[PDB]
Structures are given as structure tokens and as C-alpha cells.
Enzyme design. Structure first.
Site, short mmCIF file in Angstrom:
data_model
loop_
_atom_site.label_atom_id
_atom_site.label_comp_id
_atom_site.label_asym_id
_atom_site.label_seq_id
_atom_site.Cartn_x
_atom_site.Cartn_y
_atom_site.Cartn_z
N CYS A 104 4.02 1.35 9.06
CA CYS A 104 3.79 0.13 8.19
C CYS A 104 5.42 -0.27 7.68
O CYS A 104 6.22 0.73 7.37
CB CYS A 104 2.93 0.46 7.08
SG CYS A 104 1.20 0.39 8.00
N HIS B 6 0.92 -1.24 0.03
CA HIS B 6 -0.04 -0.13 -0.09
C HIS B 6 0.73 1.34 -0.13
O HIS B 6 0.02 2.54 -0.14
CB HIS B 6 -1.07 0.06 1.06
CG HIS B 6 -0.41 0.17 2.49
ND1 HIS B 6 0.07 1.21 3.21
CD2 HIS B 6 -0.67 -0.96 3.68
CE1 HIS B 6 0.14 0.95 4.37
NE2 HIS B 6 -0.18 -0.23 4.74
N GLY C 243 2.51 5.94 9.40
CA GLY C 243 4.16 5.84 8.93
C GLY C 243 4.79 4.70 9.40
O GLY C 243 6.03 4.40 8.90
C1 LIG Z 1 -8.28 3.52 9.41
C2 LIG Z 1 -7.01 3.16 9.11
C3 LIG Z 1 -6.36 2.87 10.57
C4 LIG Z 1 -6.25 4.31 8.42
C5 LIG Z 1 -6.89 1.70 8.22
N1 LIG Z 1 -7.60 0.59 8.77
C6 LIG Z 1 -8.61 0.25 8.25
O1 LIG Z 1 -8.99 0.60 7.02
C7 LIG Z 1 -9.37 -1.14 8.84
F1 LIG Z 1 -10.39 -1.65 8.02
C8 LIG Z 1 -8.40 -1.84 9.63
C9 LIG Z 1 -9.32 -1.16 10.21
C10 LIG Z 1 -5.57 1.37 8.15
O2 LIG Z 1 -4.80 0.96 8.80
N2 LIG Z 1 -4.92 1.81 6.73
C11 LIG Z 1 -5.48 2.25 5.78
C12 LIG Z 1 -4.83 1.61 4.43
C13 LIG Z 1 -3.47 1.94 5.06
C14 LIG Z 1 -3.65 1.35 6.46
C15 LIG Z 1 -2.66 2.37 7.38
O3 LIG Z 1 -2.74 3.40 7.86
N3 LIG Z 1 -1.47 1.59 7.82
C16 LIG Z 1 -0.47 2.28 8.58
C17 LIG Z 1 0.89 2.15 8.12
N4 LIG Z 1 1.70 3.14 7.61
C18 LIG Z 1 -0.33 2.05 9.96
C19 LIG Z 1 -1.80 2.49 10.84
C20 LIG Z 1 -1.93 4.03 10.97
C21 LIG Z 1 -2.42 4.31 12.33
N5 LIG Z 1 -1.96 3.17 12.89
C22 LIG Z 1 -1.58 2.17 12.27
O4 LIG Z 1 -1.07 1.20 12.85
S1 LIG Z 1 -5.43 -0.07 4.04
C23 LIG Z 1 -4.60 0.31 2.27
C24 LIG Z 1 -5.35 1.52 1.71
S2 LIG Z 1 -4.85 2.93 3.08
#
Ligand SMILES: CC(C)(C)[C@H](NC(=O)C1(F)CC1)C(=O)N1CC2(C[C@H]1C(=O)N[C@H](C#N)C[C@@H]1CCNC1=O)SCCS2
Ligand SMILES: CC(C)(C)[C@H](NC(=O)C1(F)CC1)C(=O)N1CC2(C[C@H]1C(=O)N[C@H](C#N)C[C@@H]1CCNC1=O)SCCS2
Lengths: 306, 306
Positions: free
Chosen positions: A145, A41, A143
Site C-alpha cells: 500500500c 491505515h 506491504g
Molecule cells: C482482507 C484484506 C485483504 C487484508 C483487506 N481487505 C478488506 O478488508 C476488504 F474489505 C477489501 C476486502 C485489506 O486489503 N486491508 C485490511 C486493512 C488494510 C488493507 C490491506 O491489507 N492493504 C494492503 C496494503 N499494504 C494491501 C493488500 C494486502 C494483500 N493484498 C493487498 O493488496 S483496511 C484498513 C485496516 S486493515
């Protein structure tokens, strides 16, 4: 003496952490030999978070569109591909700090350390468990991930987790290093929620053994139980069934303390039915379930890594 | 989201750990430039633990009597001296992995990470506080001495603790890196016990702020308090007095959440007087006091180190 939530030394993993940037998005990558692994992603746009067309997004990227930095040094990308939910960026330089390593898929109930990273640099290290519902109770911001979870054995780093998602109630989901999620989760912004979690019974028992080893013995009663009768009580309190394999894995701690596993189960049964009455065990007011039997032995016997 | 007991990445300290052996006794040393620092009780004999004559014991040692190993490589000792309770062994090789570093003496209430080591190799990493009674609640076995505690700031490792002693009830005592003990303790096997400990009020407040930042808000009441009236309640429950400096150090968290420090004090006052009624805060059933205000900001804002 003493008992702490203890993480693995992180140095071998620190030497693998890099930054991966596509346009406005930066996350962490794991650099092993001449490959950088990161969540796919990173190639997402501000708009199509709800259901990204990852194959179409990746078709349109070239090698040069991936900005990979190790410290302040750009690593030139010479190949890219997608494996399930991870990207593999081939770089023209092998990581000279690459440890001996393995990719493993851990089971629910096992533990690992997380090296939480931002922009390819480490923020901190902490110990986690893979919950029965395939989440982890981590600490992650925007950030983070691409941060990874791992165990060490002698000199070998077993990578088991890469961070991708935060789920409702502030728990976390991610993949093994082949890009396959733990649990039913997907890397898109859609309604997902964890199934109900349960308590990891074998770990609670291991932690009670650690308490006895540390002289915190007040909860030991004079009774025993059968495995079936214990599991009938475990079930009511949302504890995992205890299996014979769990019993056998507790063997070393049972032999060290002279307390039969089923006798410890009788004491745990009493704690579940009666509470702790304001007392603590190993300084905790709740029963702890994120130490495995192996974690207890490693900490209480001083096992080291090279 | 999420909040974990988080330690500093340990890699920079891992690169400094060595083994120091005198006769039958092995403990850990810290190798910086061409000096190895270790506890002086490495030169103790099986017999004179109760009151070692350290100066006479060191007079009788030669350089060659100190066996120092970095990994599997012997470091030849070319000088030795004693500074308070630490030895300084000059070696003929400067440590090529020496980080930018400082020796600091921390204050009670501050936190640091411990890299617990045996035979010069790391076992694990965990976060500790210097208790008001100058002990730490660590996890240490035979052979752990010479393990160090530290903070990191950008690229600079501030070493603040070296492990020497375990006190009754399983708490730990040690020195700064100039060999001066924290607290009234001495490196001999004699009746010593810690003074009574107290709870680090400013840290409990910081951790309540972390809870609010994570959406765990149930304990916030509608009241305020004066600083003096709060401290009258803190005193009864064995909490440190809260000072104006503590209030000012909580400024950043107060500004982020919009909750005045004295309003948070009113909520803490209610928790102390009323208990938690079976509820948890950030997953804990007790009030946590080993996160400083700075630790909370670092974890909740994703501060990294190089
Ligand atoms: C609502 C969110 C927390 C923003 C979202 N969650 C969902 O949509 C759910 F269905 C699980 C509940 C989610 O985690 N997303 C959105 C995407 C990316 C990923 C992300 O932000 N992943 C971060 C990395 N970097 C780490 C996150 C940020 C906050 N704390 C963390 O650990 S999925 C690919 C397309 S954008
Ligand atoms: C009863 C002991 C725990 C053996 C003892 N404590 C006391 O005598 C007190 F007064 C404080 C209560 C103590 O710690 N000693 C004895 C000496 C060494 C040092 C030691 O063993 N230090 C280990 C290192 N390595 C680390 C210890 C071992 C267990 N867990 C730890 O952390 S003092 C120098 C002459 S021998």
C-alpha cells in the site's frame, strides 16, 4: 511491429518512493516537494482493523512517531495531517527528484501504470485499467500500500491512484491522491465486494485496430452496423455501451486504417456472437480491453517521454 | 494476490539512454562510463542495406561524424571502434548516472525487460522472453534499435539484449552487448527467417504454480507421471523437453505449494491432451510461457531492487 502490454518508464516515480513506518507497520509513501503522501491505515493497530477510529488514532500520534526513510536516509517529519483516506507528512527536506506532476482523478476505462513497491523500494511495473466497477486487476502483497498509479505526458507525471485494499477474488481498490476512494469502498476490514464488472467496449475496438495495424486482419467481415444495433448486442455480452464520444475518440485509428468505427463494430459483433473458433488476435485467445485508443497510438507510433 | 506481466523498474536504464545520429539515421545508444554502445547499422546508407560493408563504412567516418546527444546535451566523441555488430563511441564525459552493471548473455527461456526508446527517449517498458529460436516477441518500430533488454539484481543491472532487427511475422532479433547476435541472424537486409519456435515447458509449469498460489486450482488432477512419460507428451505438442535441472529449479515453488513437480507435470499433461474447455488460468485462455520460476517467486514474494 508487435504489440505488448506496455507500461510507462518508471524512473520519475522511482525517485519519489519512500518508506513510512508507525510501530510495527511499514508501507510506501510518495515524496513530492516537502510532503510525503501515504495511506492512513499505516496508523492502524493489530486490533482495530474492523473499524479504525482514524481521527482518534491520529490525535495520539506526534511528528516523531512517523519514521520516514528515503533509501537509507531518515526524513524528519515536521507536520502531519489527514485528507480523506491519505496522510500528508510534512518533512523538513524537499525531494530534489520531484518531477513536474499533477494529481488527477481518472475515469473508468482509462489505463495507467503501477509501480509496485515494498518498504519504499520498487518491485516492478505493470499496466492496469480502472475497471467499470472501480477496481483494478493488480498484483499486490502485504506491504504494497502506498504504491501509486500514474500516466506520463511529455515531462509531466499525472498521479491517479494510490493502493489501499485487496477485495474478494483478488482485485484491488484504492484512492486518488486526495485520498478519495474509487468506487464505494472504505479502508476498514469489513464486508465489501465489487459490483459486477463489464467489458470496456471502446478499448476492445482500439485493440482490434492495433491488430489490423499489425497485419492480424482475419476477423474483419464485410458488414456494417448502426450504433444502436451494435449496443443491443454489446449489452447481452456484458459490454459497456459505446457512445458517440467513444466513436470520435476512435477517429485517429479509424482514419489510419481506413476502417469506419461502425464497420469495426460489425466485426466485433460477429466475434461476440460466434466466438474466435480457436484463433488468436495479437497472440490472445480472449478479446483484450485494457488498451485505450490513446495507448494504441502511443505504442504503434512510438511516442516518447522526457 | 494477482498476477501480472511485470517488468523491472526502468529508472536505472533510463539514465543511460542517448541518441546517436549519422547523417540521416538516428537510433539509440547506451551510455555507460565514457562509452556509448549502439548498433553498427547506424552507419548504413540509404543504398547498401542489402549487404553493408561495415568496415569500409566505418573507415570513412571520423569521431566528429557521430552526433551523440544525452537529452539536449551533445556528448563529444573522442574515439570509435566496432566490436562484432555494435559500435563503441568513446565520449569525453563519463555518465554520472551509470549504475552498477554487467554484460550477460542469457539462455533461451530466460526473461528480461525491454525499455523501448526512440531518439534516445523512453517510450515504454515491457517483459520479454528469449524464445527457443533466439527471437523475442517485442514491440518495436523504425528507430527503436539500440533499445536494450535487462534484468536487475539488488542494485546491479545486467544488460543482456540490444535491439537490431525485425524478422518476418513481426518478431525481433538482436545482440548481446558484445555485439554477438542471438541466433543465426545477421545485420543486413537479406532473407532470414526464424526456426520454428517451441513452448518453454519449465515456464509453463512455473506459471501453473503461480496460479495455485493465487487460488486458481481447478486444473490440478489426482495423478502423477514419470519425467520420461511427460516428455513424450510434451514433444507431441511442441514443448521443450523438461530436464532434471528444470525440475530442481522448480523446487522452491513446489515446496511452497506442496505439489511435487511431477504431479504438476501430470496436470499439465492433461491440459495439453484435453484443452481448457473454455476455462481460464490466471485470466488467460492459453498456457503462458514467459514467466520463469524466478519471476514467479519475485512477483509472489515482493522482491525489490535498490
Ligand atoms: C482482507 C484484506 C485483504 C487484508 C483487506 N481487505 C478488506 O478488508 C476488504 F474489505 C477489501 C476486502 C485489506 O486489503 N486491508 C485490511 C486493512 C488494510 C488493507 C490491506 O491489507 N492493504 C494492503 C496494503 N499494504 C494491501 C493488500 C494486502 C494483500 N493484498 C493487498 O493488496 S483496511 C484498513 C485496516 S486493515
Ligand atoms: C525488413 C526490415 C524489418 C527493415 C529489416 N529486417 C530484415 O532485413 C530481416 F532479414 C530480419 C528480417 C530490419 O530489421 N532492418 C534492416 C536493416 C536495419 C534493420 C532495422 O530496420 N532495424 C530497426 C532499428 N532501428 C528496427 C526494426 C524496424 C521495424 N521494426 C523493427 O524492429 S539490417 C542493417 C541494414 S538496414
Amino acid at each position: 511491429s508487435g504489440f505488448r502490454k506496455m507500461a510507462f518508464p518508471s524512473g520519475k516515480v522511482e525517485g519519489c518512493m519512500v518508506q513510512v513506518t508507525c510501530g510495527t507497520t511499514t508501507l510506501n509513501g510518495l515524496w513530492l516537494d516537502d510532503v510525503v503522501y501515504c495511506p492512513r491505515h499505516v496508523i492502524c493497530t493489530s486490533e482495530d482493523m474492523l473499524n479504525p477510529n482514524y481521527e482518534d488514532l491520529l490525535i495520539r500520534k506526534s511528528n516523531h512517531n512517523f519514521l520516514v526513510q528515503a533509501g537509507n536516509v531518515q526524513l524528519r517529519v515536521i507536520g502531519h495531517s489527514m485528507q480523506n483516506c491519505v496522510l500528508k507528512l510534512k518533512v523538513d527536506t524537499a525531494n530534489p527528484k520531484t518531477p513536474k506532476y499533477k494529481f488527477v482523478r481518472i475515469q473508468p476505462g482509462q489505463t495507467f501504470s503501477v509501480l509496485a513497491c515494498y518498504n519504499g523500494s520498487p518491485s516492478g511495473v505493470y499496466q492496469c485499467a480502472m475497471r467499470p466497477n472501480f477496481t483494478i486487476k493488480g498484483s499486490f502483497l502485504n506491504g504494497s500500500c502506498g504504491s501509486v498509479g500514474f500516466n506520463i505526458d511529455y515531462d509531466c507525471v499525472s498521479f491517479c491512484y494510490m493502493h489501499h485494499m485487496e477485495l474478494p477474488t483478488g482485485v484491488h481498490a484504492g484512492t486518488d491522491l486526495e485520498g478519495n476512494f474509487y468506487g464505494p469502498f472504505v479502508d476498514r476490514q469489513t464486508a465489501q465486494a465489487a459490483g459486477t464488472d463489464t467489458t470496456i467496449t471502446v478499448n476492445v475496438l482500439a485493440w482490434l485496430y492495433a491488430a489490423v495495424i499489425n497485419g492480424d486482419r482475419w476477423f474483419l467481415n464485410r458488414f456494417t452496423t448502426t450504433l444502436n444495433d451494435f449496443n443491443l448486442v454489446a449489452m447481452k455480452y456484458n459490454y459497456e455501451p459505446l457512445t458517440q464520444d467513444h466513436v470520435d475518440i476512435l477517429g485517429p485509428l479509424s482514419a489510419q486504417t481506413g476502417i469506419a468505427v461502425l464497420d469495426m463494430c460489425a466485426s466485433l459483433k460477429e466475434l461476440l456472437q460466434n466466438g474466435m473458433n480457436g484463433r488468436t488476435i495479437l497472440g490472445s485467445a480472449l478479446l483484450e480491453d485494457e488498451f485505450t485508443p490513446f495507448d494504441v497510438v502511443r505504442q504503434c507510433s512510438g511516442v516518447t517521454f522526457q
